[PDB]
From a paper:
Pseudouridylation is the most common RNA modification and is observed within tRNA, rRNA, ncRNA and mRNAs. Alternatively, an RNA recognition mechanism that does not rely on guide RNA factors is employed by stand-alone PUS enzymes that independently recognize and modify their targets. More recent data have suggested that PUS1 is the predominant PUS to modify uridines in mRNA. The structures illustrate how PUS1 recognizes and binds a helical RNA duplex and enable the identification of RNA-contacting amino acid residues that make extensive contacts with each RNA strand to orient and guide the RNA into the active site of the enzyme.
Substituting the aspartate residue 134 with alanine (D134A) in yeast PUS1 generated a catalytically inactive PUS1 variant (PUS1D134A) that was unable to pseudouridylate RNA. We then focused on RNA oligo R263 (Fluc positions 782–799; sequence provided in S2B Fig) as potential substrate for co-crystallization with PUS1. When tested for PUS1-binding, R263 formed stable complexes with PUS1wt and PUS1D134A in electrophoretic mobility shift assays (EMSA). Here we describe the crystal structure of yeast PUS1 bound to an RNA target that we identified as being a hot spot for PUS1-interaction within a model mRNA at 2.4 Å resolution. The electron density maps from molecular replacement and subsequent rounds of refinement displayed well-ordered density for most of the protein chain (the first 70 residues, last 49 residues, and four subsequent surface loops ranging in length from 2 to 19 residues were disordered) and the first 12 bases of the RNA substrate (the final 6 base pairs were also disordered). Rather than binding to PUS1 as a monomer in the predicted short stem-loop formation, two R263 oligos formed a helical duplex. The base pairs within the RNA duplex (involving positions 2 through 10 in each strand) display both Watson-Crick and non-Watson-Crick interactions with their counterparts, including two central G:G reverse Hoogstein basepairs. Immediately proximal to the 5’ end of each RNA strand, at a distance of approximately 5.5 angstroms, a well-occupied and tightly coordinated sulfate ion is observed. This corresponds to a location and distance appropriate to represent an additional backbone phosphate group if the RNA were extended by an additional base at its 5’ end. In the structure of the catalytically inactive PUS1D134A bound to the R263 duplex, the unpaired 5’ base (A1) is positioned within 4.5 angstroms of residue 134 (measured from C-alpha of 134 to C4’ of A1) and appears to be within potential distance to rotate into the enzyme active site.
Author numbering:
A (entry chain A), B (entry chain A): 71 to 116, 123 to 219, 222 to 253, 266 to 464, 484 to 495
Amino acid sequence: RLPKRKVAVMVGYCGTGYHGMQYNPPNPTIESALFKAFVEAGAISKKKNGFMRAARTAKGVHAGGNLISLKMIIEDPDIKQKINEKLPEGIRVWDIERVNKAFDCRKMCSSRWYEYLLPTYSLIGPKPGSILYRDIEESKTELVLDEDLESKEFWEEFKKDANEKFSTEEIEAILNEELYQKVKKYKQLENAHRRRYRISAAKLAKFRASTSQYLGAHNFHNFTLGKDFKEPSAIRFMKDIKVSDPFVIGDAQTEWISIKIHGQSFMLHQIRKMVSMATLITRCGCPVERISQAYGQQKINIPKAPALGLLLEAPVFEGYNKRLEQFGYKAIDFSKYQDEVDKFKMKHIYDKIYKEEVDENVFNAFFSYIDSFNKSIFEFLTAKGI
Amino acid sequence: RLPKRKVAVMVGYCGTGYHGMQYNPPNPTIESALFKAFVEAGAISKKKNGFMRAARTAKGVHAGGNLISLKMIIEDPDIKQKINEKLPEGIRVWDIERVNKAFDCRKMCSSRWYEYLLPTYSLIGPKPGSILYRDIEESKTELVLDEDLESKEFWEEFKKDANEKFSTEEIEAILNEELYQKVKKYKQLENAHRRRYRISAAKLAKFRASTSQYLGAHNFHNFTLGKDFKEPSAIRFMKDIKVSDPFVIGDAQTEWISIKIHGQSFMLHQIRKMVSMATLITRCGCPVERISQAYGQQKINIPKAPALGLLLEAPVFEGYNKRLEQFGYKAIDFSKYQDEVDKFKMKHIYDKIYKEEVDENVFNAFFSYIDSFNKSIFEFLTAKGI
RNA sequence: AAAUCGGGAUUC
RNA sequence: AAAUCGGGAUUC
Ligand SMILES: [Cl-]
Ligand SMILES: [Cl-]
């Protein structure tokens, strides 16, 4: 029976194929794989006496950095390498550091950094023929919304390319069939047109302003589930929002943007709902200030963005580092790993994101469902409600 | 580039932790693990040119025997052992046999055997205090339903045991707390009382009659989803139904029964809905003949039983064996493996079922939700509807 | 966080 | 078969 010390473990993972961070049998989770590696490496033996997590990343949500707290066997001086050898390629342990007895992953978390990877073709306007396009274009009863000749040019180049290859065969419905093969090739051509799209500087600036609409303290009751507008804990403080320059990655050469959000605390699916709302405001040509209207008591249903693009970048423990460094305890700083994670993120997270995006068309499917859906549609009009 | 022959592969698996049989990235499925083992063993290289499955077992559904058809590399005389070495312990390949070019897993499937493992305490009447118990007992407006002094004795022995250990503390609501620990121990005592239950011969005979209500050809539109009563394909033929004698298995010594259903063809979630309906009829004390009323055009919502207890025992290919044996092709008979599967079923399927039942309380949670739910409730009364 | 029961709108 | 968007009733 070896001794056990209460330590914090810094880890990172691609969340694809796992049912979130929190241990939840019988479905594979990040924590179940971590525990299997711990047992196979000698970190634990045989509730797990004080187990703790900093963030319960949802189904499919990745994390460049996450932390847990537990009583481990630190006797092996090469225990980290053993655990990493016993782990799958998509999960890694960055470090192991001793913590004080009163350490609490969640209560000592001062802030959180999140990153969302979004394909730039998500900001193209809805396809002509969709209900959202019909309702937005037919919003000439109040001539407020942008014109967005860029999306018009994209869709019309797609129409010219389709017509120069599918001589009025003209796909209409389907529910192992030569028709289906024809349709398959049309949708593949449309996806290829999406992948060749390069966002303009104006659309990027518009999206940056729409995301900047989130800075400061706001009532985010519409950006979660089961939160009342009058609840005081519905107010959240976003410290910073940064939208990266566009960047091309992958064999299909598809364009992406990185959205880093630093906030004091977040509610369930807050990041994805914010991202989705900013994307809809940008791609529909609405005044970005309308995002602030979402803070009102009127309830709006914001469909959360796909989990595939979400990464928990790092939890932050400001008070712990500032007020417990005199006790000899090492500070918890994920940036000390920043380069290593940066490699892992590119090799085992971002690559998975690009592969699943080009294989299953996650983002385009999400936005095609939004496009064809008869609360949010009203908000994205020229006229909202009140 | 090795040659490839079109073969059929006989496999078995525990479905826990997998998203069904059909290959469906990015979530792990039985077929994705099979393909990984195939690649690692040399069975395939690099749609999969004619891939076929006999049955698309749902999420969590096991199978003592399932079959697939594909073009494999059969050059290795020890290819089966290599694939099995490359497979996890919960998935096994029983055999590989050559098939004719026109072979079609699903179209040549003449019938199907299914097995459902049900804990006998699922047949105990609803707990006094539940809405279902209140509605059934208060069905004295039409004095039709059984009395079931056995369930009364069970619940009253539980009440005597609880009161002799929890002196009117008396748990009332909860939503890390000493109360919760008390409640935890009450529910554990109730679960232990359930695990010690041994079904009487009368209840077993009643359940056997309720299941026999399914024999022959019937309209099973209520025993699936999205099937209209007037659709001719809503009629299904059950060739045989056998309920095994009760048997005790596991460390907690819990009692189980095996329900084997041989049918020509089945609709989506038909087995689980039939099982659930028979169980409700038995545990509520209804005339078993009322099950035939479910074949009427009136729509009833039958909650499907947990997937944990379902096994696809074997698909059957009668016509293929009878009309293609002269062509030199070996018959496809899963019974030729019956002993081997029988070991695997006990070591990697039934054991998982018992462990998950005693760890997560799947069946009792399902029936506790049924018990407290304000269409089916009306059917389980003395008065149905019409 | 995850899972269940159903009901509604979609996706090779 | 699986997956998505939501809405409703539940489960350490
Ligand atoms: Cl999350
Ligand atoms: Cl199934």
